[PDB]
């Protein structure tokens, strides 16, 4: 049941990896993976009904 | 597929321009922010961008234990007139300010909760007596379960409530808790009441606090020194640290700008001037 | 056994 | 479009009602989410919902207010502002539970010689601060809920010192967005600006937002509408200009659960 | 038992650690998520949203609605600044409380391009050309159009497109700047000037406001998480 | 030895933990199970069994057999309630001590549909139609048939099938309700009315009892285990 | 001898699993799996000799 | 829990250990390297670079520029030494402060071949032959050319190639020598003599300096890391 | 995720190896491998533009 | 080796 | 699984 993931190696001395095994039945007990996703800001930065083309007039 | 530790976009080299394309001109009335990048308004070189947003992901922003309360308990001489102090705390992140402000950048959240307990003790009277090593009981009392009236009454039996028996001087205690809300997310803000005032009912009877939902939202932690009374009194403090693991957040908010004043959004007179003097044309 | 990410 | 179509000229039709505008600044869909009915996978009360459709999902016009050089701002809560609007209000008070989205259309025209800018903000869970420094969280249901008349912002916090019979109302200070956070940051909420030289309206399409799929409309407001003068009204060289502001709001995809006798609230 | 040897760090509590721990409520029936609108995945998304700058923090205008309003008028052309601002997004008092400024105050380091958008709120009949400037650091801060012209700038013509944006490109010696006032990691100078002048016809207000907004570009990032000074709890 | 580093939580005793531990009686010859009738696999099975409600907790009837008996009579039709009850299955005094109520008092949260079954214990010659009602919360609690009619209800005709069931469907704002009196998670109102009236011939008792029963439906669940208040050990 | 089972993941940040190894000869020493079965309530809720059809009269 | 047994060494802090430990700044955005010129991979690279010897540590010449200058003159031939030096690269006062000497003072043991290069700084018109010598230890240290001749040596003819190198080959009983004065691991004797004499024409300086340099050969190594005596912090 | 490397065996009593598993996501938490490279000293010892042939005159 | 549930 | 150097 071992999970093997890679580290993003910052300062250097191949891919360096690390190992994780969950010891508990409840996912609440698990550490955080930090393997997170990003998304586009659009729902906040461009919430407009008609798609904005930045080279065009915002108002036409 | 884009991850938090991916590098941000490269700057592409761009040259001079003379066209009907107007990126610089916009209209903020629409509610939108102009998506510009440097190559839209100046000449740029090609840069291979290595920086990433890894440390500002929601998880990484919150990935720290914050102190949310300090509980006080003691173990006195048996001969004391005053009762042995056991502590009772209604669980919340709103007794302190720092984690509260961070969570309040958002309206709603889901997370698993990690609680860590740091325990310190000291002597109070200028005595010369000793005390043997203390064991503490941290009992979680969920809304409905009997709250202790005495340091030694039947409730400390804990047949069903979760308890931690912590030994002094060992590693700080730690437990995890799942997302336990009765809603699909925790509400950092509730614009409403828990009761509707009816006309056919008295005002008192229909009344309730603004912005409060379940009176006993998450229950209580009750802490005691399990050791019997000792000739020399020792006082202890239990510092509780909360870390939100596996977190999701919704609906961004402007951060708290004036001092907190209670569990609601209320503010006190005399604290309403955060900003300082600075002249319009002074750097 | 082992998962690999 | 080469056939004349414009970002500024819109027509909105819901039920038996139509709004036209010739000076819009596009329109906003909050968080990119159009209103929807509750999905079976997210459903919670099991009884057949009531879905009044055109009887309630139509444009209701609230009482017109007036913008002057001394105006500090206005606020409304949803669904509270609509609680007395035709069959929407009826369906609301007859059921324990209800959910709804909204099209909010703020109207304010002037002339090419007037100037001023209104920030129109839709805030999820718009909790406002109280008037007291002796008691927190003490704004009464009656004062929290003005219905269609709404409330206003003030430039000055002034504490209710009558401790015998406390006012129990909000004291929403404008630069603090009435909730202790700076107004300049309110733009992270779904918004538009009515800047008189550019546009004469704001249109915000709001999804139902909550930490629940459905809730008590009578106990809880989901959205707050806050209108504040970001740049003050001004005209020619008149000392006392006035132009009206009208709100027209339409419920969208509203459904109700838990039918019983009608709720008769204590509103005064 | 398995022979083991306790290493340094044993039994400490690091508040930034990431370990497993026992669940106090085993087999708890968790309530599922629902698709609430407005989910945020990274704090920099919030930094990319335009929020309004409190430019005029004069003793009488600060902590009032007036601090957001930069007053312009139809006076004869001058080469003197409408406003002057330091590019210190987390520490200059005019930027530090914007949403960008606020998020930067939970981090020690920032990097990337920024953008300033100005909104003209005068009447339709009012015309004007303004010069918006960014001078990277190292010289005399621009106090006259003559100097500001020589740096990064946008000449804004007022008209139907109400607003104009100047991008402050990432131009720095260090790979990241500090979120405090620091000469080594100083960012330079933002300033606005009259290019021609505001002109109005008769029967029109001769004075008006512009509003300004700041936001981060897609190449913007922060690091080294820290506590802010923007909130406290004395006692 | 294997290099190891002691983490927080080390050496604590969490009463809800789930760890291995050494056996004090190694190689003990365990007695095998036999197939005893009545095995239970989940406490909600017990909650799905009908148990009888102590409806009439008046000062003289409480803690006696009489508390289970709701008295009806052949009086002329009225629109006034036979009984009124709050849907607070763990805390309303009439429900809290039923088997359902008891199990709910070991948990913090409940959810799902419930059902009330009434048994007519008058004579075969007695006839009658009753109205059994559930009003979800938020309005004036029904005190007259007129209001109760408008909510969820069953009109019960008395006859050979002695009993009638009204299902209280899960109708809640929250995904789970609290097992205590709480306005935010209130459940509403159960009530019973005369639809027509009880009619009897001569030589027949003019007054009789109905008995009521509550049980959980197959969609019913509880969570967050807790100690009950229904037992104590003072000293 | 490792047992690999899945967690029912409640709050989220594939299948997440956890690992269990028994260290003792006596099953009494083992932790609880919590991998439990449910059953129908019928032996208590419908103990009647003739099967009940709920749409039908209980008595005929 | 997994049965474990704590071994000796448990909980100690060895300053030379090599263990993992928790990161105080998780997910920190590290700044990438750039290709800075001059990267060093091993301290012996520095030891292979020629640095100049402070040969003349007389009371008046020491701690001044003069200590690096060995004075020669056109005097008649003598068999007497120009200089005498012990092969104790970390401890002889003339070698111990060279870059080689300095690195050796962070180690307990050294081994390998070394080389001495001398630079003639007189005028082009000056000629001369010198004898540079290395006598391995065990006999009378050479004080006359006669003895020095019998050991390892280079006869240097002065001319266009300004400099000359003598390699001190690794000749030792032990596999490594100590970085302190030690008779068991002594290295022997470096010395320089006039082979003929310095000859100059008229109108020419009759006295001049030679400069000397020491460096390690590719077969040179050090071991057992230690603190130096070449720096301290009293109070 | 186990890394198996050989030891340079000094005093003796095949190849003797040792095992390493990284326990953390951040490469900063990792121990030092000591598996390091050497380089030629030339950038410091022979920084001259024209390659030096040691048997030849350094100056010609 | 490994069992998997 | 296992890397080998
Ligand atoms: C033995 C120790 C057990 C500790 C058990 C603690 C269980 C209770 C968890 C409380 C969750 C608090 C979540 C934070 C607050 C909420 O966000 C808001 N007030 C909205 O609901
Ligand atoms: C998947 O996990 C199969 C491989 C097992 C690797 C060794 C497990 C190390 C010890 C885990 C003990 C169990 C935790 C309760
Ligand atoms: C099945 O268990 C084969 C795989 C072994 C995995 C590593 C075991 C970890 C240590 C267990 C020690 C023995 C317990 C007494
Ligand atoms: C690669 O690592 C797969 C083999 C796993 C070998 C056993 C791992 C031993 C325990 C590591 C625990 C996880 C560290 C957080």
From Swiss-Prot, chain B:
Domain of life: Viruses
Cell compartment(s), UniProt: Virion; Host cytoplasm
Region (Disordered): 1-21
Function: Forms an icosahedral capsid of pseudo T=3 symmetry with capsid proteins VP2 and VP3. The capsid is 300 Angstroms in diameter, composed of 60 copies of each capsid protein and enclosing the viral positive strand RNA genome. Capsid protein VP1 mainly forms the vertices of the capsid. Capsid protein VP1 interacts with host cell receptor PVR to provide virion attachment to target host epithelial cells.
Subunit structure: Interacts with capsid protein VP0, and capsid protein VP3 to form heterotrimeric protomers. Five protomers subsequently associate to form pentamers which serve as building blocks for the capsid. Interacts with capsid protein VP2, capsid protein VP3 and capsid protein VP4 following cleavage of capsid protein VP0. Interacts with human PVR.
Protein name as catalogued: Capsid protein VP1
Species for this entry: Poliovirus type 1 (strain Mahoney)
Span within the parent record: 599 to 881 of 2209
UniProtKB/Swiss-Prot annotation, chain D:
Subcellular location: Virion; Host cytoplasm
Coiled-coil spans in chain: none
Function: Forms an icosahedral capsid of pseudo T=3 symmetry with capsid proteins VP1 and VP3. The capsid is 300 Angstroms in diameter, composed of 60 copies of each capsid protein and enclosing the viral positive strand RNA genome.
The protein's assembly and partners: Interacts with capsid protein VP1 and capsid protein VP3 in the mature capsid.
Protein name, as recorded: Capsid protein VP2
Swiss-Prot record, chains E, F, H:
Protein origin, superkingdom: Viruses
Location(s), subcellular: Virion; Host cytoplasm
Quaternary structure (record): Interacts with capsid protein VP0 and capsid protein VP1 to form heterotrimeric protomers. Five protomers subsequently associate to form pentamers which serve as building blocks for the capsid. Interacts with capsid protein VP4 in the mature capsid. Interacts with protein 2C; this interaction may be important for virion morphogenesis.
Function per UniProt: Forms an icosahedral capsid of pseudo T=3 symmetry with capsid proteins VP2 and VP1. The capsid is 300 Angstroms in diameter, composed of 60 copies of each capsid protein and enclosing the viral positive strand RNA genome.
Protein name: Capsid protein VP3
Species, as recorded: Poliovirus type 1 (strain Mahoney)
Lineage start: Viruses, Riboviria, Orthornavirae, Pisuviricota, Pisoniviricetes
Section covered of the full-length record: 342 to 576 of 2209
